[PDB]
Write a protein that binds this ligand. Structure first.
Ligand SMILES: Cc1cn([C@H]2C[C@H](O)[C@@H](COP(=O)(O)O)O2)c(=O)[nH]c1=O
Ligand SMILES: Cc1cn([C@H]2C[C@H](O)[C@@H](COP(=O)(O)O)O2)c(=O)[nH]c1=O
Lengths: 211, 211
DNA sequence: TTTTT
DNA sequence: TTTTT
């Protein structure tokens, strides 16, 4: 049974948009971007579509946030599967925000090539717990680094419905090596950072749980 | 309006206990202990009373965890105020667990003086958001370090009731200095570690929010 | 963030 | 962890 948290502090890369589904459900959408100072010292940039659903979507749009505003987001990873109009299954993990608040300081905006900004000195953290969906296999990158792709299923329950989010994690170097023995079905906890390249969790820590 | 998260990976310092209130409410209690490798490289030990309330208390006791088992806890900081039997107001912040799971590996248990164990290579993280309760003032420690005590109120809503948790944070050195300007009422977010000495949040990061 | 001892 | 596009 699942756990699923993402915390992000970042800037709106540009203006958010409010839209409505067929059902009339309100969706608020923003691209939150920043750059983390990853202490060995890397600058890891990231850009995440964040969405707020329902009545909070309309509460959020009332706040009138603009490109460049810095915000903190508390949210979860949302897995979605759909059929493309061109035919064929598609799937993606994005960020659903349970909350978004504005920072009270002007952050430093790093300008990018394609017209957007990202926050300097940002924050990005994920904690998720679910079950490994299949036996992983150790690979090597062109530079020789051990890498392990881990697929897990995070069970969500919310008239009581069940959802599964299929979340992918990358474990590097010694982490990759310590976790080689993981099997289909094994429950696991992973913290890390949420990265673009598709949305993946880059693991900084993984723990195998009992059962 | 509040946010309140604590994540701990640690060992049961000794055997947990199941007890019952006057009302009959089940309380499960454990002392979770470990040691964090704080990357400048300190070993910061900590011992926290963790409690689970209600029917999950009895689910937890069914699991029959013993001194030395390693667990992950997801929880919140719970502020409690009471009158001592000897007369006079008392108050304390402890950890209420929403969840506790057992690790699937044997961790390394560091033995302590008074008969307990603590987990080597543990994890301790807190994120809280609330409003500053009073103007803070910069102090210095005997060694000359800037230190700032920050008091905040985390509003919780749950027939709809309001609770306030009064949580204290310590900000050191440059953090202490960057946050000198905070005023009574200012909303603030703080991540850090949960430390003994009374339970305090040692801030690694603080952000002032708008309003 | 359901709740106390 | 309420929910989709
Ligand atoms: C504005 C924006 C840019 N980008 C990418 C496209 C550009 O190739 C890149 C900008 O280059 P940079 O990362 O070297 O500053 O950022 C996004 O992925 N999402 C966005 O919303
Ligand atoms: C077993 C246990 C010990 N302790 C403290 C009391 C001892 O003075 C100390 C042990 O010394 P140490 O920290 O140098 O190993 O740990 C707790 O605070 N809570 C506990 O549950």
């Amino acid at each position: 049974r699942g756990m699923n948290h993402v915390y992000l502090i970042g800037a709106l890369a540009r203006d958010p948009e409010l839209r409505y589904t067929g059902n009339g459900m309100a969706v608020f959408e923003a691209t939150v971007a920043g750059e983390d100072r990853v202490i060995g010292e890397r600058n890891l940039p990231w850009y995440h579509r964040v969405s707020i659903l329902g009545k909070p979507a309309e509460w959020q749009a009332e706040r009138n946030l603009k490109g460049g505003d810095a915000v903190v987001v508390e949210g979860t990873l949302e897995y979605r599967q759909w059929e493309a109009p061109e035919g064929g299954k598609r799937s993606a993990v994005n960020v659903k925000a349970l909350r978004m608040e504005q920072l009270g300081t002007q952050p430093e905006l790093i300008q990018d090539a394609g017209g957007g900004v990202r926050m300097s000195g940002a924050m990005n953290e994920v904690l998720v717990l679910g079950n490994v969906t299949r036996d992983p296999e150790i690979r090597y990158t062109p530079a020789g680094d051990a890498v392990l792709s881990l697929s897990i299923a995070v069970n969500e329950n919310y008239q009581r419905q069940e959802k599964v989010h299929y979340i992918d994690a990358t474990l590097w170097r010694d982490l990759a090596e310590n976790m080689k023995e993981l099997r289909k079905g094994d429950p696991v906890m992973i913290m890390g950072r949420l990265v673009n390249e598709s949305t993946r969790v880059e693991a900084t820590r993984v723990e195998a749980l009992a059962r």
